Every structure is written in structure tokens, then in C-alpha cells.
Amino acid sequence: MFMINVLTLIIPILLAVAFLTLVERKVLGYMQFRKGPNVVGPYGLLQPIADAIKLFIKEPSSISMFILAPILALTLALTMWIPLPMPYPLINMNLGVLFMLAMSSLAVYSILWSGWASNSKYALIGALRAVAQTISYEVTLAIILLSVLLMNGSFTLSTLIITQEQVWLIFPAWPLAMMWFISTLAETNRAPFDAGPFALFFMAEYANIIMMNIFTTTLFLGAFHNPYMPELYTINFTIKSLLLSITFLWIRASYPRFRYDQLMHLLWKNFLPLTLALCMWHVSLPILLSSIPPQT
Amino acid sequence: MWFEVLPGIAVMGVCLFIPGMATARIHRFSNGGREKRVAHYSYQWYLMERDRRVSGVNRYYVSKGLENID
Amino acid sequence: MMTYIVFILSIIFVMGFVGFSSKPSPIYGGLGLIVSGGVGCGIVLNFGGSFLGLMVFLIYLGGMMVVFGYTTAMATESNKVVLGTFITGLLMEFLMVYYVLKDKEVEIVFKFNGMGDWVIYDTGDSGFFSEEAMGIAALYSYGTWLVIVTGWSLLIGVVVIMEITRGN
Amino acid sequence: MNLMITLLTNFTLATLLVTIAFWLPQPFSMKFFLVAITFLLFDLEIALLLPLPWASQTTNLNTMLTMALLLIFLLAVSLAYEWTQKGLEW
Amino acid sequence: TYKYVNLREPSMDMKSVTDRAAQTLLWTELIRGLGMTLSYLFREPATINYPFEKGPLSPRFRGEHALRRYPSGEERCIACKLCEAVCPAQAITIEAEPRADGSRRTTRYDIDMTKCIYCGFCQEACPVDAIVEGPNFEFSTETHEELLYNKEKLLNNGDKWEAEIAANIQADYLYR
Amino acid sequence: LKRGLQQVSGHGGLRGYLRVLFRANDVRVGTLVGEDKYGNKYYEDNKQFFGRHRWVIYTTEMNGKNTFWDVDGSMVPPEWHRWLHCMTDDPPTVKPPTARKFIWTNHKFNLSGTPQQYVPYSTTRKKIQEWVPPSTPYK
Amino acid sequence: SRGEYVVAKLDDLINWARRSSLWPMTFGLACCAVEMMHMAAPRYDMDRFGVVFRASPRQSDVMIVAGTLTNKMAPALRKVYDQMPEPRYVVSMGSCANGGGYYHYSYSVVRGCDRIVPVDIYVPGCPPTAEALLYGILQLQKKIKREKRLRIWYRR
Amino acid sequence: HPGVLRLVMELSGEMVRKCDPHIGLLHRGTEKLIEYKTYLQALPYFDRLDYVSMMCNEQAYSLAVEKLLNIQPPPRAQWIRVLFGEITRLLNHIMAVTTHALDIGAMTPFFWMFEEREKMFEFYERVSGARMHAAYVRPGGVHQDLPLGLMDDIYEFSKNFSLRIDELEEMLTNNRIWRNRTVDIGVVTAEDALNYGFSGVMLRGSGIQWDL
Ligand code: SF4
Ligand code: SF4
Ligand code: SF4
Numbered sequence A: 001m002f003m004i005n006v007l008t009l010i011i012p013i014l015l016a017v018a019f020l021t022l023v024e025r026k027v028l029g030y031m032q033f034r035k036g037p038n039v040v041g042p043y044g045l046l047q048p049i050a051d052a053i054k055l056f057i058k059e060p061s062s063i064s065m066f067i068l069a070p071i072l073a074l075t076l077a078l079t080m081w082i083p084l085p086m087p088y089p090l091i092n093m094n095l096g097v098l099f100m101l102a103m104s105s106l107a108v109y110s111i112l113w114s115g116w117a118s119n120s121k122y123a124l125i126g127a128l129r130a131v132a133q134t135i136s137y138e139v140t141l142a143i144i145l146l147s148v149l150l151m152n153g154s155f156t157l158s159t160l161i162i163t164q165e166q167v168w169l170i171f172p173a174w175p176l177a178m179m180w181f182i183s184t185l186a187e188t189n190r191a192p193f194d195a196g197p198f199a200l201f202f203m204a205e206y207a208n209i210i211m212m213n214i215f216t217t218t219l220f221l222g223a224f225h226n227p228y229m230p231e232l233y234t235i236n237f238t239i240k241s242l243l244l245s246i247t248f249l250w251i252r253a254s255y256p257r258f259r260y261d262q263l264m265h266l267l268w269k270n271f272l273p274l275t276l277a278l279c280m281w282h283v284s285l286p287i288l289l290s291s292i293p294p295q296t
Numbered sequence B: 001m002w003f004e005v006l007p008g009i010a011v012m013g014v015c016l017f018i019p020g021m022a023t024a025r026i027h028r029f030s031n032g033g034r035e036k037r038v039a040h041y042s043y044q045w046y047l048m049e050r051d052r053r054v055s056g057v058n059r060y061y062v063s064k065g066l067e068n069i070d
Numbered sequence C: 001m002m003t004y005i006v007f008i009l010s011i012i013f014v015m016g017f018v019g020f021s022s023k024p025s026p027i028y029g030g031l032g033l034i035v036s037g038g039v040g041c042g043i044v045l046n047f048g049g050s051f052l053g054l055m056v057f058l059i060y061l062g063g064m065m066v067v068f069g070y071t072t073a074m075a076t077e078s079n080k081v082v083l084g085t086f087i088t089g090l091l092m093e094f095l096m097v098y099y100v101l102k103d104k105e106v107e108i109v110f111k112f113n114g115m116g117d118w119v120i121y122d123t124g125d126s127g128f129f130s131e132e133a134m135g136i137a138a139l140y141s142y143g144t145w146l147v148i149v150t151g152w153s154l155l156i157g158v159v160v161i162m163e164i165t166r167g168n
Numbered sequence D: 001m002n003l004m005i006t007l008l009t010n011f012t013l014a015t016l017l018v019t020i021a022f023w024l025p026q027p028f029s030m031k032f033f034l035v036a037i038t039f040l041l042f043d044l045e046i047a048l049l050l051p052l053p054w055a056s057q058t059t060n061l062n063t064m065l066t067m068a069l070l071l072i073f074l075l076a077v078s079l080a081y082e083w084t085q086k087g088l089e090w
Numbered sequence E: 001t002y003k004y005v006n007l008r009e010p011s012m013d014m015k016s017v018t019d020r021a022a023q024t025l026l027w028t029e030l031i032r033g034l035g036m037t038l039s040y041l042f043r044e045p046a047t048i049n050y051p052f053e054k055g056p057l058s059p060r061f062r063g064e065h066a067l068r069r070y071p072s073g074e075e076r077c078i079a080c081k082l083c084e085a086v087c088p089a090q091a092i093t094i095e096a097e098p099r100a101d102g103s104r105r106t107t108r109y110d111i112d113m114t115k116c117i118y119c120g121f122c123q124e125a126c127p128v129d130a131i132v133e134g135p136n137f138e139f140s141t142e143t144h145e146e147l148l149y150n151k152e153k154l155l156n157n158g159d160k161w162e163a164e165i166a167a168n169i170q171a172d173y174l175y176r
Numbered sequence F: 001l002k003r004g005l006q007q008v009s010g011h012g013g014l015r016g017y018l019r020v021l022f023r024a025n026d027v028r029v030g031t032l033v034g035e036d037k038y039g040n041k042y043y044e045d046n047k048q049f050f051g052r053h054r055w056v057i058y059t060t061e062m063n064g065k066n067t068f069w070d071v072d073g074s075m076v077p078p079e080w081h082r083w084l085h086c087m088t089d090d091p092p093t094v095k096p097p098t099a100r101k102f103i104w105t106n107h108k109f110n111l112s113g114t115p116q117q118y119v120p121y122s123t124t125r126k127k128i129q130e131w132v133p134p135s136t137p138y139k
Numbered sequence G: 001s002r003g004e005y006v007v008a009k010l011d012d013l014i015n016w017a018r019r020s021s022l023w024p025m026t027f028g029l030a031c032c033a034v035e036m037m038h039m040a041a042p043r044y045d046m047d048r049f050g051v052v053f054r055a056s057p058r059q060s061d062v063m064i065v066a067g068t069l070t071n072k073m074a075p076a077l078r079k080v081y082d083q084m085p086e087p088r089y090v091v092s093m094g095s096c097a098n099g100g101g102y103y104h105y106s107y108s109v110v111r112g113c114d115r116i117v118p119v120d121i122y123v124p125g126c127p128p129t130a131e132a133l134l135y136g137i138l139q140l141q142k143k144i145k146r147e148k149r150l151r152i153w154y155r156r
Numbered sequence H: 001h002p003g004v005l006r007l008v009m010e011l012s013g014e015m016v017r018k019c020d021p022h023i024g025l026l027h028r029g030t031e032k033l034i035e036y037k038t039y040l041q042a043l044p045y046f047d048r049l050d051y052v053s054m055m056c057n058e059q060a061y062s063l064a065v066e067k068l069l070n071i072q073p074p075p076r077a078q079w080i081r082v083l084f085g086e087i088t089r090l091l092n093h094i095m096a097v098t099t100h101a102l103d104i105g106a107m108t109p110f111f112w113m114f115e116e117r118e119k120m121f122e123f124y125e126r127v128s129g130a131r132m133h134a135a136y137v138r139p140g141g142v143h144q145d146l147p148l149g150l151m152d153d154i155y156e157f158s159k160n161f162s163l164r165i166d167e168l169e170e171m172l173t174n175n176r177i178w179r180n181r182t183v184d185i186g187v188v189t190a191e192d193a194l195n196y197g198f199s200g201v202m203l204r205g206s207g208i209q210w211d212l
Helices: A002-010 A012-032 A046-057 A063-079 A097-118 A121-135 A138-150 A158-163 A174-187 A198-220 A231-252 A260-284 B006-029 B042-054 C005-021 C026-044 C052-059 C065-073 C080-101 C131-136 C144-164 D002-023 D030-049 D061-084 E014-026 E028-041 E082-086 E121-125 E151-160 E163-171 F014-023 F078-084 G002-020 G032-036 G074-082 G130-145 G149-154 H030-036 H040-047 H056-069 H075-104 H108-127 H151-171 H176-181 H190-195 H201-205
Strands: E093-095 E108-112 F041-044 F054-057 G062-066 G089-093 G121-123 H006-011 H017-022
Touching: A002 A012, A002 B006, A002 D002, A012 A046, A012 A198, A012 A231, A012 B006, A012 E028, A012 H108, A046 A198, A046 G002, A063 A097, A063 A198, A063 C026, A063 D002, A097 A121, A097 A138, A097 A198, A097 C026, A097 C052, A097 C065, A121 A174, A121 A260, A121 C065, A121 D030, A138 A174, A138 A198, A138 A260, A138 D030, A158 A198, A174 A198, A174 A260, A198 A231, A198 D002, A231 B006, A231 E028, A260 D061, C005 C026, C005 C080, C026 C052, C026 C065, C052 C131, C052 D030, C065 D030, C144 D030, C144 D061, D030 D061, E014 E028, E028 H108, E028 H151, E028 H176, E082 E093, E082 E121, E108 E151, E163 F078, F041 F078, F054 F078, G002 G130, G002 G149, G032 G062, G032 G089, G032 G130, G062 G074, G089 G130, G121 G130, H030 H040, H040 H056, H056 H075, H075 H108, H108 H151, H190 H201
Parallel strands: G062 G089, G089 G121
Antiparallel strands: E093 E108, F041 F054, H006 H017
């Protein structure tokens, strides 16, 4: 039965990614001005299934490095929905947010290995700069994560989903949460913040995207947990994660890519004092409001 | 409008709904109707361990309550 | 599928250290060292094991080999000696495994009781606060001097790095 | 063995998907370097900082407050030193 | 008269600088751009289904390169070579024998659809309005053999419709 | 509230509604202008915007073809091709024909890459007419 | 002949999969590039078909030559064409590209892209109508409906 | 692809030393082909040397020939020529803005204004019939005048397009990030703008007042 838990965890995320591709193409069309895909298949679902099939059919380093980059990217994509408390998480990790950070770092490894095995100097310097702007935001992500769980005591994240029954945690740290959400945009490598098997590489990218969406929805807000009926909590949680993913599309389809030096200059000299000042305020302040959270 | 985008969004919303609901279904199914315990600390592990010891069936969910009194 | 999983993971650990001690191309070396750090983290997370290896998993395998691969890719870019030393190191591994298994004790200059050992281990004692996590939850009450000199050496490392890489 | 089995299933399904994906056909910049070492040092100071909420329940609150502000203040001072000394220009 | 742009500075009034700083620190006009593109999300999309609704045209569109003929009559071309004389890409090849019954005619009247730039100079120049651009644009030819028209291809192409070109010439005997 | 439920019955039944939407694309039925040879139907709405006034709906098996799927351009007769591009605002039921005896009534459609498509050849008789050597052999 | 029936339906499946997506790369030199980016406009979506513009030549499906191919261009053209995956299909758009056309009689014009790459679908026009280019993509998709690759591999 | 050009840049990294824009890739022999053809038969060469200015190049060639040939064209020809000149100017500026956007990133304003550009192509369809290369401006006044039922449609377009360009400035134009992308770069000294042969929008931007 535990193997059935495993398969229901790691198989339907692939269907989730494929239907995310159709949703982002459709909604970005309706943003832009486009019906479509609506011709191949009823309302475009056979179209992404055929996308994945056709990309599997085609007939395209150091086969060590050439295979060890996408195998690591996609095993990260599989392993990284382990402790997310869709009410009962699959493994009750006593500390999981540090696991989130560590596997972001492993994704950095995957991109660097594929860039090394690309073996062409323009792609090499491009992958190098992409590694630097992937690594340049795991500072801010870590420190904001630190300050938002300092309000809630423990790394366990189940205590977090307890503590967000009273208020949505977007209120008692809104600018901190906003800066974390911009750093999720940076870590997902999408607009504004910017060879094979592209199916695997693409797949790992979008699974990391939906991971950050779900982790945003769990880390900051949620619904009241019904005793002995978690279906309603799962419904409202999933709808909030989907509305944030549509909001993520909504930010995608409207802004140009930054210049790379503007990106770094913006990160250091604009996030990094402001994150530090907000984080020291969340250090010094719960000791001033007679409120330190109970690590159990 | 959105009149042709809610099919894909609805199907993908079911496809994201399914692992949590199936996991809760299996957590209730694989405990005799109870909830799985969560021992973060060694104290709750010892408490759970003596619980599965005194059930006799090597299965703690039975919990043999107020029946081995006298 | 058996008891001695600590000894098994330690064999994979020694395999990894040999696999980059044979001096390969340095990105093969980085791959082997990532595998070594992962199974060392698995070992310490198997000795309970709550926090500290996973803590350093961010740092040693999240903040070090990235910088090594970075500075290897922007510096520079099969042979019988490397493969020969790897096979002989594997052979010394095989011989030490054999002398652990089909003997009683192994001595390099010690005595090692040759059997897989969960011993010694805690006797299920009531912690309730996850001892090593509260150990790391020191340094901030009793740790006056230590974090002072540590942060001070961090600041001096900063100014040293930039000066050597052409301050200003 | 739960999470070891899950990890192994992730690895095996990923290798299955890679083998299906494979078998069916069948000079530099100095500014690059300072980003890495700047990350390395600030990530080390992260590694010092982040077990703070485990610690946040002591009886010597004033000492914890003072050394915590010492740590973040030194992090911001190292940032301020490279900021004044044009440490990340382009 | 010159009405030039950006001769103005952000004035140093305290409300001006705190509104610009709120624009900076709170991303406000960015969110205004978000609201703009959502206002175009909720519109009705301006697409057309192609294979069931073909796009609009004019009566004066330039198409197909057909030869016409008289009302139940002979070939309206005479082989007077004007269409080669003004064809800029020179895709028109004309060779003109007179036929058996004394009247002057052709042998060979060829267009290269590869070469034709579709101006209708031959349309403006044919003195009897024989060669006329058609309405439709559907060739999509798999071969480079087929895109060299001959006289019987052009006459069958003129056989494939007249009532279209009848309505077009009835719409364009007045302007052209 | 109303349009998404009075449309299947407004199409005639769930046989056709499955047919019309799974066919290719669209469900904007209802105006019933005409139909013409090789079965095809022609509708003109007066409710939506320009370019979505008019549409053909093709039929199957019109030249030994089984064209339920993969509909072509120019399966259409030419008078509806005048109608459909909005070269006129008037249907071709006013005066379609002409009394000329050379127009196809068959409309041999797009045919490239079939057993039947056009090939080029020089439509000219003999060029130089060589001297034929004689019949009776000397010596 | 259950094997042959499986071969028929499986060939149907992979031919449907090949014709379904077809994301191209736009080569696009002159004003026919403007016409391609006008048949990606709202009034003619390639994205109704799943046909998505993409500048990645390592995953391109159909190469659309469009514009005035020159001698100075042509080695770069076939260097692009070589590092394209073996399922490749070629649309020659425009009278410049399907036979030289208006700049036929000059130096530095290859007389159509037949001399460089093999061509599947010629579509004429100077410029072609966007609507006509979409029709040309439809007739290419009917060619992809007519492949019988798996039948030929079954009885080769 | 990032037009189509050879760029040969030489740089210290994330930076520059000097570059060479190599062009000649799209060379077609237009001047030679006009040297063998006549005036009317080569007016399309001027129509498609530049392809965006599908009427302004026509107007320039026709005024070259009319200036050489002593012909003052009639007034309604002049007004129709000026109307189409301003329309093609509108289309050329809107392409410049939108391909600047699609170069920079910035997906959606490209498609808004290409809906607009499809409508103006439809007006060229009704006037000449050609999609883009409406040659149509014969030397000696414009042949084949505009048909009945057009000017009020241009009037309707004018109202709706003034709204759509207000909405385009709402989208772009004092955005934080587009300003952040391109303000600092591309300064041109107006004295050097005169001497380096910069003409048109460059003289608009750098200082000195000029308009033909
Ligand atoms: S101009 Fe007309 S009549 Fe003269 S040769 Fe050409 S098609 Fe024939
Ligand atoms: S339309 Fe132009 S290129 Fe074509 S045949 Fe006529 S004159 Fe020649
Ligand atoms: S065929 Fe005509 S429209 Fe196309 S690139 Fe050539 S000149 Fe331009």
C-alpha cells in the first residue's frame, strides 16, 4: 500500500506538468489574444499528450555527463514533494525546509553539469551566468524562510500548517513574503529572470515551478483544517495553489527580461539590505511582544 | 473568454487534488480507521512502542482499551 | 536488505573517496565528492541524525562543490595510472572487507571488533527535545566567545578575498 | 526504509524515463569569480544564523539578542564594506 | 512648431518624493500594468477559425492567373505579347502560331508561378482583359514540376470558375 | 446561464453536438442560410463580429475521399467562394450561374500529390523536321 | 493479421503525433518574415494547431525558408539545416525562395532553395497571404497523414 | 536568431572592446536589375527594397520621376498620396516599437499592435488588393482610385486606434523595468549626429531641430 502511496505521489505530477503546459499556453493566449490549442483534440488536451509522444519519438557530452545531468534534474523533480503537508505529508520530516534549500542547490549542480557537457564556449559562458543568477537568490530565499518560520517555531512545517489557522501569514510579514515570491520567480528561471533531452530538462523545470507554488501556498496561507475530513482542506489548498500559478502566468506575460548586471545589482543592493533589516526586525520583535513560539 | 480554458484547469485541478486525497484515504485505510502517529521525538516513539507492545498483535491501532483491567 | 546498513554505506563512502583520490579530471572529481558527501550525510542521518548532517548538506554539498565546479569551468579543462590506482584502492577495500568478515578483529594500529555494530546506541531514553538540535540551539546563550571570533574571521576572510582578487 | 524506498523509486522511474528517451532512436572574467566567493561567505554566515529559532527559548534573552544582532550586523557590515569598495561593479 | 518630450524634473515636494518612493518600494505602476493586461484577458478574442471561416478579401484582390474566354467563345487572348512586354519578372513566355482557320493564335503561353510577383501589370495591360487575377490563393504545391503553368492548365483554371471573375470584372470595369 | 444548455438541443441532439465540436472546432450554430452541392452547408450570423459572419461546414465522402476528418481549402463551389470572403454582402442565391457551356460542375479540388495532378509539357508541334533517309537501298 | 492491425493503428498514432505539434523555426530573411510573424498574429493563430514559434534549431520540426536566399547566406543555411533532428520537413515560402523569382537574374541569388535543401511544400506568393501559408501548413499536415513509415518498416 | 545580420563583436567580458556589423548577407542586386529595366517595370524594386514603407518608397520614387519630368500631379492624387503616406508612417513606427519589444522580451504589446496592423493591411487590400506590396503609385499620380465605402471606415479606425495607442502607452512608457532597461545607453552628441550621417529619428532624439 505504501508503494501505492509512492506511485500516486510521483506519477500524477507528470500529468500535472503536461496539463500545466496546456494551461499556461491557453491562458497566455487569452492574455495576449489567442484561442488555442483547440483544434487537435477537444479543447487541447490530446495536443500536449501528443507533444510528449512526438518529443519521445525523435532521433537526435561524455555519456556519463550527458546522462547524469537530466537524471539528476528529474530525480530532484520527483523527490521534492516529499514533506509538503497536503494534509498528511508522505514523510513526516522533523525538518524539511532545509531539505528544500539543499535540493535547490542540487538543481544548481544539474544546470552546471549540463553546461559543462554542452562543450561549446558560448553555451559554457551562458550556463555559467545562469548558474550565478540561480545561486544569487538562494541567500534571500533562505533568510526570508528563516524569518517566516521564526514566527512559528520549528522546522517541522506541520506546526506551520497548525499556526496558519488563525491568520494568513501574508499579513504579519507582507514585504518579506513579497520578496520571497520575487525570489521564487528568480529561482524558477522564467521571465523576467533569465541540448537535450529537452523533455526531461523542461519537465524538471516545470515540476520545480509547481513545487515553489505549492510551497508558497503552504508557507504563507491556507485554510482551516477539518478534523477527520481533509478533503475540504485539500480542495481549498489546491485552488489557492492554482490561483497563484495563474498569477505566476499573469506576471510572466507582461514584462521584459532584465539585463543581467541589472539583475545582480538589483539583488545585492536592493534586496539584501532590505531582507536583512526585515529579518533582524523579526528577530528582535517577538521577544518584545511577549511571544516566542513553542518548539515543542 | 475563459469558456474553453476551464476544462484544462478543471482536469489539472483534479490531477493536483488526487495525491493528497489518496494519501489520506490510505492513511485511514492502513490504520483500521485511525490516523497514523507522528513521533518527532524519542518520547513519542517510546510511547508508541509500548503501545504496539501491549496490543499483543504487534499492531498499535487496536489499543486494547480498558479491557485488560482485571 | 539486512542489518549492517551503516557498514554498507561506509563501504560506499570509502569507494567515493578512492574514486576521486585517483586524481581524475576535476569535474569527475567533483562528481565523486558529491556522491561521497551524500552518503556521509546518509551515515550521520542514520546515527540519529535529526539535524546536523542535513544542516551541512546545504553547505558542504550546497555551497562548496558549486563553487568548485564554477572555478573549474572558468579556469581550464583513459590514462593507465588513474585506472590502475583506482583498481588497487578497490582491491585494498576488498581485502579489508574480507578481513572484517571472515576473522574476529582487524588492526591497522588499533583493535577493531570485526562485526557489524549497532552497538553502542541509546537505550530508548526519554529525550523529548532532540538532543543534537538543542546542542545546536546552543552557541547563542553560552556561546559568547565562539561566534564572536567566528564572525570576525568571516569578516577578515571577506576583506582578504577581495584584496587578493585586486582590492580595489 | 520508507524514504529510502521512495528515493530509489524516484531514481528507477527517472532511469526508466531516460532509457525510453534514449533507446527509441537506437579566458574569463574576474567579476564572475567574486560572485561565487561572495555567495560562499554569505552562505557561511547563513549557516551560522539559521539555527536561531531552535535557540530562541533561553533564559538569557539579552545575550541571545545581542549576539544575534552582532551576527546580522556583521553580515550587513561585510556587505557595506564591499558596497563602499565597489566590490560588485560590472 | 515643435512639441518636445521630457523637459521636466520630478519636483522635490515631500508628497512628490514619497509618491515616487511608494512607486519604487511598492511596485504600484507595475501592478497597474498587470491590471491592463488582465483587462485584455477578459475581452473576447479576435481570432477566426480558418478552415471553416476563410478571411475577408476585396473585390480587387490579386490571385490565381487564369485565362478567360469569350461568352461561349474562343480564347480571349490573341498572343499580342503585351503581358510579356510588361511582366517584370518575365515569367510570361509566348509563342504564337496562327491556327488553321486563318485567325491568329498561340502555341505556348506559360507563367512561372515561381517567378511571378503578382502585380497585375498583365491585368492592367491585357488589351482585351483575357488574363485576369483570380480570387483564391491555394496552391501549396508538393512539386517544383507543377509550378510551371501551361496553356491548358490556365484554361482549365479559367474553366474552374467564371462567375467569380464575372462579378469582379463587373466590379472593375468602372475604376480600372 | 442559458446559452450553454439550450445549444445541444439547439443543435438537434448530442449526436451532432459531439460531431460538430469533435469534428474540428466550433459550436456557433443556428442561422441556416443554405447548402450546396457535395453536401456542404453555409451559415451566416448577424450577432458576432466581422470575419465571424459566415462559415462553411463541409461534409464527408464528396469525391471518393472519406473527408469526415482533414477538410481542405477549396472543397467549395465558386459562388460560395465569392460569398464567403465577404466580397459581397449577398448570398449566391440571387444569381449564381451563367449560361455558358464551358464551366465544370464537378469542381475537381486540390489534387497535388495524388494519382491525378498537373504536369508540365511544351505545347508546340515539331521543331526542325530531320531529313529522313530513303527506303530503297542503293547497291 | 492482428500484428498488421496493430501496425496500422500504431502508425496512425505516431503520424497523428508528428502532425499534431509541429513547432517550427522561422528562418525568415526579408518581408516574408514579416508575413510569417503576421500569421502568428491574433487573426491567424498557429497556436490553435499547437504549432508554436521557437528559435531553437535542435528541436525544430519544419524549417520554413522565407526570403531572398543569397550566396553569402547559403553555407549558414545548410549549417543550420544539418544540426536539425532527422525528422525534418521543409516549407519553401515565397517567390524568392521557391524558384528565385523577382531577383532571379542576378548574381548572389540561389535560384530557389531547391539547390540547398530538399523541399517538401512549395507555397507561392510575393508575399503570400498569411491565410495561404496556413493552408500550406494544412497540406503539409495531410502529407504527414500519408506517411506509412511503420508499414514500410514492417514489410521492408 | 537573437533582421538577419552577421555581428562580429570583440569584448572584454560582459562588456566590449569593438565590433564589426557585417552586412551583405541580404544583397540582391537591385541597382543592377534596375539598370536593365524600365521605370514602370522596376517600381516594385523600390517598393520592396525597404518593405515596411510600402507606400513611402513609392512616393519617393514617384516624386523623383515627377521632379525630373515636369509634371505637377492633381490635388486629389496629392491628398490620397499624403493619406497613405501617413498611414504607412503609422505602420512603420508601430513595427519599430513592437519589434523593439519582441527583441527586448515583452511579448503581449507585439500582438496587440499586430491586430492593428492586420486591420491596416485590410485597408490596403480594399484599396489595391495586395496584402503588403501595393505598388499602386504610378509615376504621374496614383492609378485606380479608392472605391466607395472607405473613408468613414478609416474614420472609425482612427477613433479606435487612438484608444489603442493610449492603452499601449499605459502598458509600456514609464514602466519601471523598461526605463531600467533602456535609459542609460545610446547617447549621441548632436554635432556628431550631424557629422556621422545620422538622419531621421536620430536628429529627433539628439537636440537639433530638423524635419523635411
Ligand atoms: S496581353 Fe492579353 S491578349 Fe496580349 S498576349 Fe498577353 S494574354 Fe494575350
Ligand atoms: S502579375 Fe506581374 S509578374 Fe505575374 S504575370 Fe502579371 S505582370 Fe508578370
Ligand atoms: S517573395 Fe516577395 S514578399 Fe517574400 S521575401 Fe521575396 S520580395 Fe519579399
